[PDB]
Amino acid sequence: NRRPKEDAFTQQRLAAINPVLTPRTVLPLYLLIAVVFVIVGGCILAQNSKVDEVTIYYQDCMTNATSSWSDIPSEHWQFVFHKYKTYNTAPQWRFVDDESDDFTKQRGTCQIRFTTPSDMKNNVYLNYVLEKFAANHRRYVLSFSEDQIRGEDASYETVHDATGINCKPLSKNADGKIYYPCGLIANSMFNDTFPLQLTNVGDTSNNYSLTNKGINWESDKKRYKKTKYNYTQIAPPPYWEKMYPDGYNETNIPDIQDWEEFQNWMRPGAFDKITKLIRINKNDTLPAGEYQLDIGLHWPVLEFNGKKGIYLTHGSHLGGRNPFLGIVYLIGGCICAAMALILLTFWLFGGRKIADASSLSWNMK
Amino acid sequence: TFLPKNILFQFHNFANVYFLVLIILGAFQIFGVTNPGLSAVPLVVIVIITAIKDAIEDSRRTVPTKKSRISRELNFSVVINFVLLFILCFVSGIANGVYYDKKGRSRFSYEFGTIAGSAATNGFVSFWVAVILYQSLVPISLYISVEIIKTAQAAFIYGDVLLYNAKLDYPCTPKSWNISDDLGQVEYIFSDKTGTLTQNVMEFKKCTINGVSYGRAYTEALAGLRKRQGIDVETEGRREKAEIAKDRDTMIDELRALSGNSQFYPEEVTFVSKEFVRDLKGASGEVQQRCCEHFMLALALCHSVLVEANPDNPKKLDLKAQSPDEAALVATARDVGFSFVGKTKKGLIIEMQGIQKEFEILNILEFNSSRKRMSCIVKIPGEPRALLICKGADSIIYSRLSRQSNSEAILEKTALHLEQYATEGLRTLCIAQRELSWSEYEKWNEKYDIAAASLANREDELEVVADSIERELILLGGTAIEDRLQDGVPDCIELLAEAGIKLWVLTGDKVETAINIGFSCNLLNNEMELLVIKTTGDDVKEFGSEPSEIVDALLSKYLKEYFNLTGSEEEIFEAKKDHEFPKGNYAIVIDGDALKLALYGEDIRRKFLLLCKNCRAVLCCRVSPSQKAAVVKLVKDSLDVMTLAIGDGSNDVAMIQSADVGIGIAGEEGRQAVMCSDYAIGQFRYLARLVLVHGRWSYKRLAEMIPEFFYKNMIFALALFWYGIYNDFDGSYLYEYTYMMFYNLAFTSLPVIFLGILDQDVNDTISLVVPQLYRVGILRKEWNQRKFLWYMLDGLYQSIICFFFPYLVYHKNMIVTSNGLGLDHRYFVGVYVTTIAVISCNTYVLLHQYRWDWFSGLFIALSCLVVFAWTGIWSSAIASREFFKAAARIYGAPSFWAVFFVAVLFCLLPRFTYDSFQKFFYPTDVEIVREMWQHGHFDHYPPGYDPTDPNRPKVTK
Ligand SMILES: CCCCCCCC/C=C/CCCCCCCC(=O)O[C@@H](COC(=O)CCCCCCCCCCCCCCC)COP(=O)([O-])OCC[N+](C)(C)C
Ligand SMILES: *[C@@H]1O[C@H](CO)[C@@H](O[C@@H]2O[C@H](CO)[C@@H](O[C@H]3O[C@H](CO)[C@@H](O)[C@H](O)[C@@H]3O)[C@H](O)[C@H]2NC(C)=O)[C@H](O)[C@H]1NC(C)=O
Ligand SMILES: *[C@@H]1O[C@H](CO)[C@@H](O[C@@H]2O[C@H](CO)[C@@H](O)[C@H](O)[C@H]2NC(C)=O)[C@H](O)[C@H]1NC(C)=O
Ligand SMILES: *[C@@H]1O[C@H](CO)[C@@H](O[C@@H]2O[C@H](CO)[C@@H](O)[C@H](O)[C@H]2NC(C)=O)[C@H](O)[C@H]1NC(C)=O
Ligand SMILES: Nc1ncnc2c1ncn2[C@@H]1O[C@H](COP(=O)(O)OP(=O)(O)O)[C@@H](O)[C@H]1O
Ligand SMILES: *[C@@H]1O[C@H](CO)[C@@H](O)[C@H](O)[C@H]1NC(C)=O
Ligand SMILES: *[C@@H]1O[C@H](CO)[C@@H](O)[C@H](O)[C@H]1NC(C)=O
Ligand code: ALF
Ligand SMILES: [Mg+2]
Ligand SMILES: [Mg+2]
């Protein structure tokens, strides 16, 4: 015949619960969330206050520093040591000009001396910071070629005419060669030469040694590959022509697989501040003392008022030092507790009857 | 021609053409920023799905353009969403131009940029790239999701097993699969009577021949009238049925003693008049004997009954008829001794008390629901004569009567007898005959031939020639046939009156019969004033002089007396606003003659409508199909409301098509009202089930699913606008492209679709036990535009939270990893944002579901798991260029999880606290009914409960 199939689905009788939110069931949930979130916020704020960091901005080292050691203005450095809340002890810097380099926009060497009154346990990250450098714009952030990242010897059209991510403005020079790392992302790299150690000023017998290995994810070496170009099909980008003046030849074409600072730079920072790891030390604790960092200024940042700096930290489990997560967990817990108390107050004031068939809108009129 | 027609029918839309322009703007006019090849997968997938559904419809037709109210309000909400998207694009373009104008930036150094003079050009290209960035703020899957929800709700209406009528083998087949949410806003029901509320199975009970009343029967409607009067029913009825059985036995004996009749079968004799056969012999004289003989001869001749064989008895005849009235008349005419057997090539052959003599039926003026009568012309042998036997409604026949050739005593006696029978509750007919001379008949026959042979609407020509020929008649009597209510119409009408629905009954049968059925089916009750609007002379002579003014006076008097209004556009504009079920317990009973006058002029129509907007019950009687349609159109146009029109027949067809939800009943008359209808139930009692359960559910479902859709789109598509602040509204995407497409495809669709398909506030048993929950749909409380705007505001606030919580976890030093390595790419910040957004919108849908079934919960859980699993599956493949290990790098960072949990809390705490404050201190009727259900006041009702079924177990309490 035509009788429909009787089944819990087609008759809409699926097994189910019907959660009515009465006070006796919601107020305990509110209080449970409140207590859990307040506990977690307290633990996060505790374990985050213990994070110590050192930030120094050295963009003004060519014009504000002298040839002898002088204190850094207070607007540049920012020390945070939890055991020492009142530790000013301003750092000092000294500019060692370099008259051979003819790139007078930024040249020389900024020597920075800081003093850490406590340790940094066994895993010390030295990043660099860049402010007001816009690496999130539409044309810039898409100007690279994943045929060259992945190792291929992409021809001119594969590199310049590709859809989406294509090194369009920097695809080929005048001579007819393909800029090897093409696009505005690789061409505009960060150029300062950070040192492979923190010179110990106090006792120069033991310098703190930093490395540039393991500063990027080990899984990035599946995506970045040594190029298969031929030193006659590639030239360096227009801004790598102080690093490779004679061009590319048999032994200088960069291996972008082990070049981990490149793999850090080709990951454009989403926002206006850019903090990229550049030196790590995963072996030794950094004991208290006065250290010295010899940065070799190369990268111009004053033509756009940008700042560049260092940021030495040990870190945390949740990243660096940021009071936000604990603050907002405490705020969430306190808001849930306040709403539970408010519902309890109004429910002991104007508490109505629950299953009252007399409160129905038709039994009242 | 499938594909071109389908693509045209689709790109008649603005979302489809918007996405086509997006594909062309990313490909042919490519600025460079897009993955153009796969940017079409959303559009291609949705157009493929729509083409498949159109193929389904075409196959179903291989096996009327009505739109619900929420569809029109949905178009308005779509327009508001596009206005918001344009405002976003405008702000983006303005701010990007303002920025590109500034004269010291990183781009004059490291981005090989120049000031393109009058940077308004770059601001313009920025607007046009923002239009492509916010491609998710467009409702693109909204229409396919609403069609999926509506088709699934209609499939459940079909596959419901409590809407299946096992006798006719007819499930409630929805003829329109897209207005199922109108059954939850139905406010008026315009119902026929004799096939809708009463089963069209007639038993001939009484008759009046030559002013003499015959027949005796104590029926259920008569018992109801006696109870209404006050006298006890069972005490009298026992004795009355005893006497009826005795009288029937004696009458069968006397019919057997009269003569030998072939088709006389006493096992189904329904006429019970002993005095009829007592007068057939000698009682009231030879004049009365001949009168009764001629009356029964007219009954056995004037009809359209076809004669066939019984498969059981080869001799027995079945008397199949298209009109149950004719069926009953011919059955009684054959029982009394005037058997109608066979139908020769000319006329009919009639057995008159044993002797067969053939008659000649020359013209059959067939019955029409607009003529309200029928007649046939038979030859009387000798110069032979003509006899026009005319049969139909009593008012029509009385209008078409002669003034000189009538006793005017039989006239008033038959009128009083028909009034008595109609008040008792029987369908009254009048039988009249015309003696025609040969010359008059020849004249009229040639007129009839030249009218029938004509093309170009022969109907009106036949009507005019019949109205000319039938103008002179002589009355010989009237009959009465009993019509029993359907099974469970009192219970269904009680449900539909509790639910706040006003039931109008548009009959074509007598005023007194309509009122009797109203009292019997609980449309009207005792202590109810029947504000009758009759324009009848007995009161016309006192009210005024001439009609079309007596009805105006009556409407104005009843208005100014019973309510404090008068017919005026001010009153009409004030009454358009209110939808409450009226109080006052009044009922209008307006005949068709007064309905014509009350519908003529605009001022009197306004008066009549303001009078009938009150008065819970209305009974329009002696109404033609045109007037049925006119009343429905009047109440649906003025005081714009939702109307349902239920019935069967060619007249209810015009009533059904002219209403929002027209329901047709598979009745004894052919299925002509089932075809031109939207649903098709087997009996009236299923209207309560259909309307309350399925329509209320479908209204609640769509009214919750649509704002939820706009909100879930807004969260995701506005986190991109928020990111624009931190790249100067330049047009770099915060999200991966697969994220941008899969969000509305897979990450968020099935929760809202299942909220629309499978959600139930309270189950069917409680929907029918507390039917007053329907009043919210009647009042339009579930779906406003204020509700959609509150949902969009919540989506905007939650988008703020979803973006600026990951942003605030980064902003300090951009180090969020446990091992100091970098996560600062905007695709990884977008993973943060997206995971928060998807889980919050899915948990919003879950918290706003009323019933947590395992199906809905399972697919909510799977939508969340799919976000996580697609990230884990697309990362680990190097085909994701810059996204190569976002899974292992992000899901392994405790900052991700800290942000995840507190941002989901902050997304859901405002709304959940508002819901808690509501459900505590201003609980709606459904929330109070659910708190009663939890404690178990509805624990003794069975699972499949229908209080509109006679053979149901009596409930415990
Ligand atoms: C899930 C994984 C992801 C899915 C992807 C997302 C998709 C979203 C999923 C949505 C699922 C919604 C399913 C609705 C359930 C219907 C049940 C029902 O009432 O059947 C009843 C009526 O059967 C019919 O009348 C069928 C009519 C076909 C119309 C389309 C039905 C589903 C509409 C959905 C959209 C239409 C398709 C649009 C293109 C997709 C019972 O039928 P029966 O028992 O067989 O009676 C036979 C007995 N007899 C033979 C004696 C008579
Ligand atoms: C380190 O990076 C620096 C910026 O990324 C880069 O500076 C760029 O140096 C090139 C030449 O070496 C300059 O190129 C232009 O210089 C002037 C401009 O008028 C012209 O005379 C030249 O012909 C050429 O057009 C760039 O201007 C300069 N970058 C900026 C922003 O000014 C250093 O060269 C890099 N140094 C090392 C050692 O890698
Ligand atoms: C620690 O670093 C200092 C500075 O780089 C090293 O001292 C230099 O040693 C070289 C070796 O001949 C001399 O030419 C320089 O003049 C020294 N400079 C200074 C400032 O002392 C020192 O050698 C390093 N530590 C060890 C153990 O080698
Ligand atoms: C920390 O110690 C590890 C080994 O314990 C050093 O790793 C080696 O570094 C040298 C430097 O050239 C490499 O040649 C070796 O291949 C490395 N070995 C391994 C196993 O990685 C690391 O250099 C030390 N780091 C610091 C900052 O001193
Ligand atoms: N077969 C018939 N022959 C003569 N009159 C009829 C017939 N059927 C119905 N009528 C008359 O028509 C009137 C109703 O016609 P209709 O418009 O069909 O109303 P309803 O909706 O009650 O059937 C009744 O008063 C009845 O007396
Ligand atoms: C050097 O530093 C001093 C101290 O803040 C400041 O006043 C001065 O402007 C700086 N010199 C230049 C050239 O900026
Ligand atoms: C290759 O080029 C580099 C320039 O960086 C140069 O120092 C080196 O000597 C060249 N090698 C040969 C073999 O010429
Ligand atoms: F509803 Al009818 F004839 F009026 F079937
Ligand atoms: Mg019929
Ligand atoms: Mg009829």
Residues B457/B415, Cβ–Cβ less than 8 Å: no
Structure tokens at B507: 């009959």
* Residue B639 Ramachandran class (φ > 0 left, ψ -120 to 50 alpha, else beta): left
User: CATH number for the domain including B864?
Assistant: 1.20.1110
Given an 8 Å threshold on Cβ–Cβ distance, is A319 in contact with B169? no
Q: Sort strands B188-191 and B643-647 into parallel, antiparallel or unpaired.
A: parallel
Q: Which residue has the tokens 């009385």?
A: B398
Q: Which amino acid is at B576?
A: K
Of A146, A144, A127, A282, give the one whose Cα is nearest residue A220.
Answer: A146
Q: Is residue B914 part of a domain?
A: yes
Residues B216/B288, Cβ–Cβ less than 8 Å: no
Residue of B nearest to A217 (CA): B821
Structure tokens at B58: 């075409």
Of B594, B423, B402, give the one whose Cα is nearest residue B518.
Answer: B423
CA dist B385 and B899 (Å) reads 103
Of B375, B499, B484, give the one whose Cα is nearest residue B426.
Answer: B484
Catalytic pick from B192, B552, B660, B728?
B192
Of the candidates A11, A325, A356, the beta carbon closest to that of B161 is on A11
Of the candidates B730, B810, B931, the beta carbon closest to that of A137 is on B730
Directed axis angle between helix B233-258 and helix B220-229, to 10°?
140
Q: Is residue B545 part of a domain?
A: yes
Same domain, B513 and B530: yes
Same domain, B257 and B297: yes
CA dist A27 and A33 (Å) reads 10
Report phi then psi at B428, rounded to 5: -100, 135
Report phi then psi at A323, rounded to 5: -75, 10
Q: How far apart are the first and last CA of chain B?
A: 62
Q: Dihedral of CA B237/B243/B246/B247: which sign?
A: negative
Of B901, B900, B867, give the one whose Cα is nearest residue B748.
Answer: B867
CA dist B878 and A223 (Å) reads 7
Resolution for the entry shown, Å: 3.2
CA dist A69 and A92 (Å) reads 6
Distances (CA, A) of B625 to B485, B513, B521, B622, B647: 22, 19, 23, 10, 12
Same domain, B132 and B260: no
CA dist B738 and B401 (Å) reads 83
CA dist B356 and B337 (Å) reads 12
Ligand 5 mean position to B274 CA, how many Å?
28
How many CB atoms neighbour CB B537 within 10 A? 10
Same domain, B478 and B527: no
Residues B479/B206, Cβ–Cβ less than 8 Å: yes
Q: How far is B676 from chain A (nearest CA, A)?
A: 21
Residues of B with Cβ-Cβ distance to A274 under 8 angstroms:
814, 824
E strands within B707-767? Answer: none
- Which distant-in-sequence residues (6+ apart) come within 8 Å of B251 by Cβ? B269, B271, B272, B273, B274, B276, B277
Q: Which residue has the tokens 């104008």?
A: B101
Mutate to test the pocket of ligand 7, among A180, A231, A232, A252 (most ligand atoms within 8 A of CB): A252
Q: Which amino acid is at B847?
A: L
Which residues 877-906 in chain B show a CB within 8 A of chain A?
A: 878, 881-882, 884-885, 888-889, 893-895, 898-899, 902, 905-906
The 3-state DSSP class for residue B869 equals helix
CA dist A143 and A169 (Å) reads 8
Q: Is the CB of B109 under 6 A from ligand 2?
A: yes
Report phi then psi at B29, rounded to 5: -105, 40
- Which distant-in-sequence residues (6+ apart) come within 8 Å of A118 by Cβ? A52, A81, A83, A84, A288
Beta pairing partners, A223: none
CA dist A284 and B350 (Å) reads 123
CA dist A337 and A340 (Å) reads 5
Domain hosting B210: range is 198-482
Q: Is the CB of A212 under 6 A from ligand 4?
A: no
CA dist A151 and A253 (Å) reads 13
Q: Is B277 exposed, middle or buried (0-12, 13-18, 19+ CB in 10 A)?
A: buried
Domain count within chain B? 3
CA dist B839 and B216 (Å) reads 75
Residues B474/B406, Cβ–Cβ less than 8 Å: yes
How many CB atoms neighbour CB A25 within 10 A? 10
CA dist B472 and B752 (Å) reads 69
B367 is in an annotated binding site: yes
Of B369, B368, B366, A29, give the one whose Cα is nearest residue B377.
Answer: B366
Same domain, B320 and B445: yes
Please give the distance of CA A67 from its chain centroid, rounded to a whole number. Answer: 33
Same domain, B577 and B501: yes
Structure tokens at A296: 């070799």
CA dist B148 and B178 (Å) reads 10
Of B891, B862, B858, give the one whose Cα is nearest residue B874.
Answer: B891
Of B768, B773, B772, give the one whose Cα is nearest residue B942.
Answer: B768
Q: Provide the b/e sequence for A193-229 (b: ≥16 CB within 10 Å).
A: ebbebbebeeeeeebbebebeebbbeebeebbeebeb
Q: Is residue B338 part of a domain?
A: yes
- Which distant-in-sequence residues (6+ apart) come within 8 Å of A181 by Cβ? A144, A148, A187, A236, A237, A240, A254, A256, A262
Same domain, B717 and B740: yes
Note the residue count of chain B: 957
The 3-state DSSP class for residue B771 equals helix
How many CB atoms neighbour CB B297 within 10 A? 20
Q: Is residue B449 part of a domain?
A: yes
Q: What is the CA radius of gyration of chain B?
A: 37
Residues B866/B746, Cβ–Cβ less than 8 Å: yes
DSSP B317: B
Structure tokens at B418: 């028909």
User: CATH number for the domain including B617?
Assistant: 3.40.50.1000
Q: Which residue has the tokens 């709403």?
A: A339
Residues B743/B717, Cβ–Cβ less than 8 Å: no
Distances (CA, A) of B339 to B94, B318, B325, B326: 94, 12, 17, 14
Q: Which helix (H) or strand (E) holds B863?
A: helix B854-875
Same domain, B788 and B924: yes
CA dist B10 and B410 (Å) reads 69
CA dist B386 and A30 (Å) reads 93
CA dist B777 and B642 (Å) reads 10
The 3-state DSSP class for residue B772 equals helix
Structure tokens at B691: 């309307």
Q: Which helix (H) or strand (E) holds B713?
A: helix B696-724
What angle (nearest 5°) sits at the alpha carbon of residue B364, between those of residues B363 and B366? 150
Of B386, B210, B391, give the one whose Cα is nearest residue B302.
Answer: B391
Q: Whose CA is nearest to atom 11 of ligand 6?
A: A64
3-state SS track over B214-273? ECCCCCHHHHHHHHHHCCCHHHHHHHHHHHHHHHHHHHHHHHHHHCCCCCCCHHHCCCCC
Q: Sort strands A307-313 and A124-131 into parallel, antiparallel or unpaired.
A: antiparallel
Q: How far is A221 from chain B (nearest CA, A)?
A: 11
Residues A77/A123, Cβ–Cβ less than 8 Å: no
Q: What is the CA radius of gyration of chain A?
A: 30
Residues A298/A193, Cβ–Cβ less than 8 Å: yes
The 3-state DSSP class for residue B363 equals strand
Q: Which residue has the tokens 């947590």?
A: B852
Which residues 132-161 in chain B show a CB within 8 A of chain A?
A: 156, 158-161
Report phi then psi at B692, rounded to 5: -55, -70
Same domain, B180 and B125: no
The 3-state DSSP class for residue B69 equals helix
Q: Sort strands B355-358 and B361-368 into parallel, antiparallel or unpaired.
A: unpaired
CA dist B634 and B619 (Å) reads 15
- Which distant-in-sequence residues (6+ apart) come within 8 Å of B198 by Cβ? B483, B484, B485, B486, B489, B517
The 3-state DSSP class for residue B28 equals coil
- Which distant-in-sequence residues (6+ apart) come within 8 Å of B135 by Cβ? B19, B22, B717, B740
Which atom of ligand 1 approaches the CA of A9 most closely? 17
Given an 8 Å threshold on Cβ–Cβ distance, is B822 in contact with A2? no
| Rounded-to-10 torsion of CA A105, A304, A75, A56 | -60
Specify the experimental method.
cryo-EM
Last residue of a domain, one of B463, B482, B501: B482
Residues B428/B422, Cβ–Cβ less than 8 Å: yes
Q: Dihedral of CA A278/A283/A287/A291: which sign?
A: negative
Distances (CA, A) of B229 to A190, B512, B520: 103, 15, 13
Last residue of a domain, one of B448, B482, B516: B482
Q: Is the CB of A233 under 6 A from ligand 6?
A: no
DSSP codes joined into one string, B382-441: ---EEEEEEEE-HHHHHHT--SSSS-SSHHHHHHHHHHHHHHHTEEEEEEEEEEE-HHHH
Q: Dihedral of CA B288/B289/B294/B295: which sign?
A: positive
Q: Is residue B956 part of a domain?
A: no
Ligand with smallest separation from the Cα of B483: 5
Report phi then psi at B801, rounded to 5: -65, -50
Q: Which helix (H) or strand (E) holds B798?
A: helix B786-810
Structure tokens at B805: 């919580």
Residues of A with Cβ-Cβ distance to B852 under 8 angstroms:
16-19
- Which distant-in-sequence residues (6+ apart) come within 8 Å of B670 by Cβ? B322
Last residue of a domain, one of B482, B513, B545: B482
Report phi then psi at B331, rounded to 5: -60, -45
CA dist B825 and B829 (Å) reads 7
Beta pairing partners, B385: B380
Given an 8 Å threshold on Cβ–Cβ distance, is B811 in contact with A303? no
CA dist B356 and A35 (Å) reads 101
Of A288, A310, A347, give the one whose Cα is nearest residue A126.
Answer: A310
What angle (nearest 5°) sits at the alpha carbon of residue B626, between those of residues B623 and B632? 85
Given an 8 Å threshold on Cβ–Cβ distance, is A16 in contact with B825? no
Q: Is residue B541 part of a domain?
A: yes
- Which distant-in-sequence residues (6+ apart) come within 8 Å of A311 by Cβ? A53, A54, A55, A126, A127, A128, A129, A275, B813
Residue of A nearest to B758 (CA): A12
Q: Does B379 touch chain A (CB under 8 A)?
A: no
Residues B827/B737, Cβ–Cβ less than 8 Å: no
Q: Is residue B780 part of a domain?
A: yes
Residues A138/A212, Cβ–Cβ less than 8 Å: no
Distances (CA, A) of B415 to B203, B237, B412, B418, B429: 21, 27, 5, 5, 11
Q: Is B469 exposed, middle or buried (0-12, 13-18, 19+ CB in 10 A)?
A: buried
3-state SS track over chain A? CCCCCCCCCCCCCCCEECCCCCHHHHHHHHHHHHHHHHHHHHHHHHHHHCCCEEEEECHHHCCCCCCCCEECCCCCCEEEECCECCCCCCCEEEECCCCCCCCCCCCCCEEEEEEECCCCCCCEEEEEEEECCCCCCCCHHHCCCHHHHCCCCCCHHHHHCCCCCCCCCCCCCCCCCEECCCHHHHHCCCCCECCCEEEECCCCCCCEECECCCCCCHHHHHCCCCCCCCCCCEECCCCCCCCCCCCCCCCCCCCCCCCHHHHHHCCCCCCCCEEEEEEEECCCCCCCEEEEEEEECCCCCCCCCCEEEEEEECCCCCCCCCCHHHHHHHHHHHHHHHHHHHHHHHHHHCCCCCCCCCCCHHHHC
Structure tokens at B55: 């193929």
Same domain, B705 and B661: no
User: CATH number for the domain including B390?
Assistant: 3.40.1110.10
Same domain, B148 and B237: no
Q: Which helix (H) or strand (E) holds B340?
A: strand B340-341
Residues B699/B776, Cβ–Cβ less than 8 Å: no
Distances (CA, A) of B363 to B379, B441, B730: 10, 11, 86
Distances (CA, A) of B180 to A207, B183, B821: 80, 6, 56
| Rounded-to-10 torsion of CA B591, B597, B599, B605 | -110
CA dist B408 and B392 (Å) reads 20
Please give the distance of CA A79 from its chain centroid, rounded to a whole number. Answer: 19
Please give the distance of CA B469 from its chain centroid, rounded to a whole number. Answer: 42
Task: Based on the residue annotation, tell me whether B192 is a catalytic residue of this protein.
Answer: yes
CA dist B133 and B120 (Å) reads 19
Same domain, B245 and B187: no
Of B485, B659, B515, B477, give the one whose Cα is nearest residue B591.
Answer: B515
Please give the distance of CA B84 from its chain centroid, rounded to a whole number. Answer: 35
Mutate to test the pocket of ligand 2, among A98, A100, A239 (most ligand atoms within 8 A of CB): A239
- Which distant-in-sequence residues (6+ apart) come within 8 Å of B647 by Cβ? B191, B192, B195, B196, B655, B656, B663, B664, B665, B673
Q: Is residue B762 part of a domain?
A: yes
